[PDB]
Amino acid sequence: MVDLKRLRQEPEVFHRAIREKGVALDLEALLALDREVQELKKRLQEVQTERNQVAKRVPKAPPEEKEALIARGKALGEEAKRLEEALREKEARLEALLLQVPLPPWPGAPVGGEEANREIKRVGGPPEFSFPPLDHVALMEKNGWWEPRISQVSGSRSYALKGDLALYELALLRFAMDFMARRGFLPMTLPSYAREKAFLGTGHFPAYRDQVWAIAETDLYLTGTAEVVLNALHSGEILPYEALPLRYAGYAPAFRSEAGSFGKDVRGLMRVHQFHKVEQYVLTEASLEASDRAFQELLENAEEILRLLELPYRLVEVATGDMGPGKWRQVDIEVYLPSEGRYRETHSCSALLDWQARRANLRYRDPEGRVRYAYTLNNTALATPRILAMLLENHQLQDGRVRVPQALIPYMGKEVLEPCG
Amino acid sequence: MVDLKRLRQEPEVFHRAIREKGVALDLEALLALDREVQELKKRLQEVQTERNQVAKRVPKAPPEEKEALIARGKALGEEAKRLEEALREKEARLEALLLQVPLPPWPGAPVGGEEANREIKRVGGPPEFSFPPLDHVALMEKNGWWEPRISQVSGSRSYALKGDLALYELALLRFAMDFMARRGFLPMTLPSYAREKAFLGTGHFPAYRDQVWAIAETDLYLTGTAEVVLNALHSGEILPYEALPLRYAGYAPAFRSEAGSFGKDVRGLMRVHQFHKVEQYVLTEASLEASDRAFQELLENAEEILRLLELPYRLVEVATGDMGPGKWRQVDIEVYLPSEGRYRETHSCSALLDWQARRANLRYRDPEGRVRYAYTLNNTALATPRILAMLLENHQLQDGRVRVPQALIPYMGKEVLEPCG
Numbered sequence: 008m009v010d011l012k013r014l015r016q017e018p019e020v021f022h023r024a025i026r027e028k029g030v031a032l033d034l035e036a037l038l039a040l041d042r043e044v045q046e047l048k049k050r051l052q053e054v055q056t057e058r059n060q061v062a063k064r065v066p067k068a069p070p071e072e073k074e075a076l077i078a079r080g081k082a083l084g085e086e087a088k089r090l091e092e093a094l095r096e097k098e099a100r101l102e103a104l105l106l107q108v109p110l111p112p113w114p115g116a117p118v119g120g121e122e123a124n125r126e127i128k129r130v131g132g133p134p135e136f137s138f139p140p141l142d143h144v145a146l147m148e149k150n151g152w153w154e155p156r157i158s159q160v161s162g163s164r165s166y167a168l169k170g171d172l173a174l175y176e177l178a179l180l181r182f183a184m185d186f187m188a189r190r191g192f193l194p195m196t197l198p199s200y201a202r203e204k205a206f207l208g209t210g211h212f213p214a215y216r217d218q219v220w221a222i223a224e225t226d227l228y229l230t231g232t233a234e235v236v237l238n239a240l241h242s243g244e245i246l247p248y249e250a251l252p253l254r255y256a257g258y259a260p261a262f263r264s265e266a267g268s269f270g271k272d273v274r275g276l277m278r279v280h281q282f283h284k285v286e287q288y289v290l291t292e293a294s295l296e297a298s299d300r301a302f303q304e305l306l307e308n309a310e311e312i313l314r315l316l317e318l319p320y321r322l323v324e325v326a327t328g329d330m331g332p333g334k335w336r337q338v339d340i341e342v343y344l345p346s347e348g349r350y351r352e353t354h355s356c357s358a359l360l361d362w363q364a365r366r367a368n369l370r371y372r373d374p375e376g377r378v379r380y381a382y383t384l385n386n387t388a389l390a391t392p393r394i395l396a397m398l399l400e401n402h403q404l405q406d407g408r409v410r411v412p413q414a415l416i417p418y419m420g421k422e423v424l425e426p427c428g
Numbered sequence: 429m430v431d432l433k434r435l436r437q438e439p440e441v442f443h444r445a446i447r448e449k450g451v452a453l454d455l456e457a458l459l460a461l462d463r464e465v466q467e468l469k470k471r472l473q474e475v476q477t478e479r480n481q482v483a484k485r486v487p488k489a490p491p492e493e494k495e496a497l498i499a500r501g502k503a504l505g506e507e508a509k510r511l512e513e514a515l516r517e518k519e520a521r522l523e524a525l526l527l528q529v530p531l532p533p534w535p536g537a538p539v540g541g542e543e544a545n546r547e548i549k550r551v552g553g554p555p556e557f558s559f560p561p562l563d564h565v566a567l568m569e570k571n572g573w574w575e576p577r578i579s580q581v582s583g584s585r586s587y588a589l590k591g592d593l594a595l596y597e598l599a600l601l602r603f604a605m606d607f608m609a610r611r612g613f614l615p616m617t618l619p620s621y622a623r624e625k626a627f628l629g630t631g632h633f634p635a636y637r638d639q640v641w642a643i644a645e646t647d648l649y650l651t652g653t654a655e656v657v658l659n660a661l662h663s664g665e666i667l668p669y670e671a672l673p674l675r676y677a678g679y680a681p682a683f684r685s686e687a688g689s690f691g692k693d694v695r696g697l698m699r700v701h702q703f704h705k706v707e708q709y710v711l712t713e714a715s716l717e718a719s720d721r722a723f724q725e726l727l728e729n730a731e732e733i734l735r736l737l738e739l740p741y742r743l744v745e746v747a748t749g750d751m752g753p754g755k756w757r758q759v760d761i762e763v764y765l766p767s768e769g770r771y772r773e774t775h776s777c778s779a780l781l782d783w784q785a786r787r788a789n790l791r792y793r794d795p796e797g798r799v800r801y802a803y804t805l806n807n808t809a810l811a812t813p814r815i816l817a818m819l820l821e822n823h824q825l826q827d828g829r830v831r832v833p834q835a836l837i838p839y840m841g842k843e844v845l846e847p848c849g
């Protein structure tokens with residue numbers, strides 16, 4: 008949500024945002040609609056208040072003038088319900104539209120879709136294997152580390168891990184939570200469902216509605232990221248300046264409808280409906296430099312986890328067309344997946360300024376007593392099973408076993424994932 | 429799903445079983461419908477046969493005997509139509525009814541509802557405090573260990589744990605996966621959703637259908653127990669005798685609608701819609717002896733876990749009217765919850781003989797080459813957040829902090845859970 012005041016004052020700024028980000032929104036039609044709502048609230052002021060006057064004149068009016076006043080009162084009331092109900096219809100239309108206005112991207116955002124994305128940096132590289140490398144599904148198949156029968160039970164885009172890899176999954180999630188807690192984020196284990204209001208807050212509703220699974224006969228939705236929950240915790244609360252920046256490391260199961268197919272056909276561990284994710288969430292003050300400092304920390308944290316995971320990665324500046332309506336700036340971190348001879352997203356770091364704060368109503372009292380919308384940022388800390396696709400392929404040994412990175416040997420108990428059966 | 433052959437020769441056993449388990453099932457109506465379906469199938473046999481063997485006699489028959497055979501063919505033909513309409517209609521409701529027939533309770537199960545549940549033994553005393561104890565909610569409030577704001581994001585029966593208790597919720601799940609792996613159970617991390625067929629396989633559908641959330645616009649339901657996934661894995665597979673017993677320790681998020689109204693203020697970490705559960709599942713060969721061995725193993729595992737967690741517990745033989753339609757035996761394990769002065773269920777061990785194997789179609793090739801239905805059993809290994817409630821109350825220190833059991837100190841990194849504030 009954008010400040011309707013700034014929207015009215017400098018709509019060309021939002022017009023470029025709608026153009027470069029590709030939002031289907033007619034800014035001129037929204038702006039128009041707003042004028043009508045303004046107009047109709049004023050006209051409704053007139054009738055409900057002339058009605059106030061007629062009703063005030065009624066109690067001691069002579070019988071002649073008293074019924075004239077009832078007559079006038081009725082017509083005016085008619086008018087008022089007509090206007091009232093027109094306003095409500097128009098305002099709902101305005102709000103829905105307002106919910107589609109995107110934040111302007113940062114000045115250096117590449118303009119265009121995913122193909123405009125720009126590699127910032129690359130640390131580490133494709134492993135040079137002494138032998139012919141298997142892909143992660145073939146490592147799993149060979150060591151008996153996943154349960155293919157899960158598709159008959161739950162459907163496709165499901166996985167069930169077994170043996171050492173079951174254990175490894177859990178070790179990586181705890182690892183990421185421990186690493187976030189030593190970086191000063193407050194670890195939180197959270198639910199994977201939220202009411203609608205929390206999805207609206209983040210911006211997942213309306214634009215990414217397609218992607219969320221509703222829990223039927225409830226008013227709950229399962230969340231695709233712990234971010235829907237972390238962002239809505241302080242809605243309607245005004246935070247002390249001294250609380251800022253809030254740094255939450257939230258773990259929750261994530262659920263995605265994944266209404267959108269894998270061109271690299273369908274499966275393995277890359278795109279499943281249910282996965283586990285530790286999220287990095289920050290609420291900071293409404294300054295660009297506070298945002299920039301948080302974005303760089305969010306980024307370095309994710310890089311740091313990849314270095315401890317010993318994975319080759321690169322950072323990518325996400326183009327306007329691809330960052331989504333509420334993003335100021337987005338950088339993805341992609342890790343190399345040998346079997347596809349390409350980098351794959353494992354983390355997206357977004358800075359959304361106050362676009363989510365004005366929707367989720369997140370506010371703080373600045374050093375001068377002024378209440379302000381906060382700025383929010385988020386980045387993945389670690390999501391499984393997807394990084395398992397990359398750990399298996401980058402760390403596979405000759406025999407098909409997989410070495411665990413040094414930092415994860417305390418969490419596993421061992422240096423090598425053994426086969427199951 | 430019971431063996432219809434036993435259902436027909438021992439109906440009194442099933443009648444005692446329907447009454448003692450308090451199942452709402454008219455047994456005469458079922459056995460009657462079963463006889464109607466058998467006579468119809470026999471009769472259809474008889475029809476299709478005579479319709480074949482007179483159409484043989486017909487074509488070139490002495491002209492007068494030919495029309496009598498034609499006449500008989502018209503009669504037999506319309507009768508087959510009728511027989512099939514009735515059979516299609518009556519088989520359907522008999523299958524729907526068989527899906528409701530309870531397994532006979534083991535002889536030693538108390539007969540009565542929840543009130544007849546007999547305590548078998550108790551291990552460990554109430555903790556003795558140099559101070560008046562706080563309940564687990566006041567311990568979480570005091571220490572800043574949960575996030576009350578989640579109620580507004582997600583509704584009631586939600587928890588969000590913070591700081592050391594978030595980390596302690598993950599550490600306990602890992603400990604239970606490692607305890608199980610070391611006991612020979614194969615660790616698996618699972619989805620929390622399955623198709624309806626997996627629920628019919630365990631007995632959760634139809635009887636408990638209302639305890640289960642459905643994912644809307646999807647043919648998937650969220651599982652309240654990993655047992656639903658684990659049990660549907662080998663469906664339609666004929667397992668080799670040598671694979672047996674299959675000992676699986678699965679972890680999945682568990683979702684429960686909790687449609688059971690309310691009564692006591694079962695607030696805090698005790699009854700939530702979403703929790704984490706590590707599950708013991710055994711699929712064994714079809715002998716009682718096999719089952720009793722497994723049952724005891726499952727119980728000793730949950731006992732050993734609770735010993736490791738340094739918690740006072742008791743075992744409870746569940747009564748016939750409380751164990752549920754599929755159970756042969758159920759023994760609940762209850763831990764002492766100091767603030768309620770009562771024991772609360774943490775684990776529930778069930779032996780179901782072949783009642784789920786016949787529903788999910790789990791079979792094995794026995795040592796003589798006979799394909800038999802397997803027996804299944806299951807028990808909680810460790811579920812969070814309910815155990816955290818007994819853990820905080822039982823291990824609370826004078827200062828409102830909580831000691832970590834020796835067993836869990838390697839998982840925790842510390843001996844005491846520190847406050848967030």
Ligand SMILES: Nc1ncnc2c1ncn2[C@@H]1O[C@H](COP(=O)(O)ONC(=O)[C@@H](N)CO)[C@@H](O)[C@H]1O
Nearest residue numbers: 653655698699700703773774775776807808811814
């Ligand atoms: N709504 C809930 N909130 C919190 N924990 C729960 C809830 N429902 C069940 N549990 C936990 O999970 C355990 C088993 O649940 P139960 O109702 O006995 O179903 N039975 C099973 O799931 C068997 N698979 C054994 O695990 C309980 O003992 C308790 O520890």
Ligand SMILES: Nc1ncnc2c1ncn2[C@@H]1O[C@H](COP(=O)(O)O)[C@@H](O)[C@H]1O
Nearest residue numbers: 277278279282352353354355387390393
């Ligand atoms: N469907 C999925 N399956 C597995 N991991 C996923 C899935 N969706 C997203 N992820 C992971 O979660 C991260 C952040 O998700 P997103 O906020 O959508 O970028 C991605 O970089 C992946 O690590």
